[PDB]
Design a protein around this ligand. Structure first.
Ligand SMILES: OC[C@H]1O[C@@H](O[C@H]2[C@H](O)[C@H](O)[C@@H](O)O[C@@H]2CO)[C@@H](O)[C@@H](O)[C@@H]1O
Ligand SMILES: OC[C@H]1CNC[C@@H](O)[C@@H]1O[C@@H]1O[C@H](CO)[C@@H](O)[C@H](O)[C@@H]1O
Length: 314
């Protein structure tokens, strides 16, 4: 199933999945526009909310996130447009702190500000959405994203994953941050290794050997659950950084994709690309030259990716 998996030509849709936004005419129009492109996968991504990086409570569902029925509506539409769907619940902090820096002073204590408490909340969230993934026939489920500070809590990640397996029979991945592929201890517990592969333009050429080594060592396919670059000046040096300032620069985004596609080998361990990202409210192509986001629609990167993905498809 993991070994046999068709090469992934994917796009992430709809983040952060704010309540009500996917049930709109706009979101429907955006998903249709996505499906005009040579993608075989879409990821429905959304974030629950922590107040602070040291708070064990996670808010998800309405009024924060899209409802379960909004998720189902988008999954149904995607499937009817011929796409396979990955469901990706994650968590953000209201103060803007990256989820890769969540931290607790205590390991244990269900009613304390502890790792145990936080994983209790997170595990309930994952079980909730693994069940939604089953309901909606999602072909993949992503159990976490860029949780660098949480990753050493290996027993707790294994408990979380096991719970997902009781609720969901499809492909399961965990999405680590770039630079963590060779660090995560629990790849044996998922079906596919995946990362947020925001490697700078000039590093693709020399990062490939470690990606190859990780995949081959774990006898599991590896793919990128996030990859992209904003269309802003200099962003190619820090494609992970959504806050990087810069004038709109369409070619810089294209150069990122050209560098990535040049470097990635045609070898069976590598299973492809889930691009970051596509908004639920899509700008018209006439406005694309003034857009500095990760979206490739209406920009030269659209053609770079479509040329690459059409060639893979054919
Ligand atoms: O990779 C996407 C996330 O990147 C974060 O920034 C990290 C970066 O990834 C590297 O670990 C590093 O150069 O240090 C940074 C932390 O300051 C954040 O920009 C997140 O919002 C991204 O999701
Ligand atoms: O920096 C690009 C990605 C890297 N991985 C996680 C993801 O959060 C990040 O994207 C941005 O996410 C924030 C909300 O977390 C959003 O405001 C931005 O506009 C990007 O989608």
């Amino acid at each position: 199933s993991a070994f046999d998996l068709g090469f992934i030509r994917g796009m992430t849709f709809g983040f952060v999945g704010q309540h009500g936004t996917w049930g709109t005419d706009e979101a429907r129009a955006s998903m249709r526009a996505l499906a005009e492109q040579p993608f075989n996968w879409v990821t429905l991504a959304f974030a629950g909310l922590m107040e602070h990086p040291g708070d064990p409570a996670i808010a998800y569902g309405p009024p924060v996130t899209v409802s379960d029925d909004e998720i189902a509506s988008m999954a149904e539409l995607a499937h009817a447009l011929g796409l396979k769907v990955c469901l990706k619940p994650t968590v953000n902090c209201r103060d803007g702190t990256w989820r890769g820096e969540i931290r607790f002073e205590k390991e244990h204590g269900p009613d304390l500000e502890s790792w145990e408490a936080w994983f209790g909340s997170y595990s309930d969230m994952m079980a909730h959405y693994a069940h939604v993934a089953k309901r909606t026939g999602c072909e993949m489920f992503c159990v976490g994203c860029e949780m660098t500070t949480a990753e050493p809590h290996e027993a707790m990640w294994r408990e979380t994953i096991a719970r997902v397996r009781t609720e969901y029979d499809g492909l399961v991945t965990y999405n680590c941050n770039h630079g963590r592929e060779e660090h995560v201890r629990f790849w044996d517990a998922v079906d596919l290794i995946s990362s947020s592969a925001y490697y700078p333009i000039d590093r693709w050429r020399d990062r490939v050997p470690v990606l190859r080594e990780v995949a081959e060592a774990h006898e599991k396919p590896l793919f990128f659950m996030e990859v992209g670059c904003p269309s802003r000046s200099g962003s190619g040096a820090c494609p992970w950084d959504y806050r990087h300032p810069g004038a709109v620069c369409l070619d810089e985004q294209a150069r990122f994709y050209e560098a990535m596609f040049a470097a990635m080998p045609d070898e069976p361990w590598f299973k492809g690309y889930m691009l970051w990202e596509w908004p639920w409210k899509l700008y018209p192509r006439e406005a694309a030259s003034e857009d500095g986001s990760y979206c490739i629609y209406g920009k030269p990167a659209e053609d770079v990716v479509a040329r690459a993905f059409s060639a893979i498809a054919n």
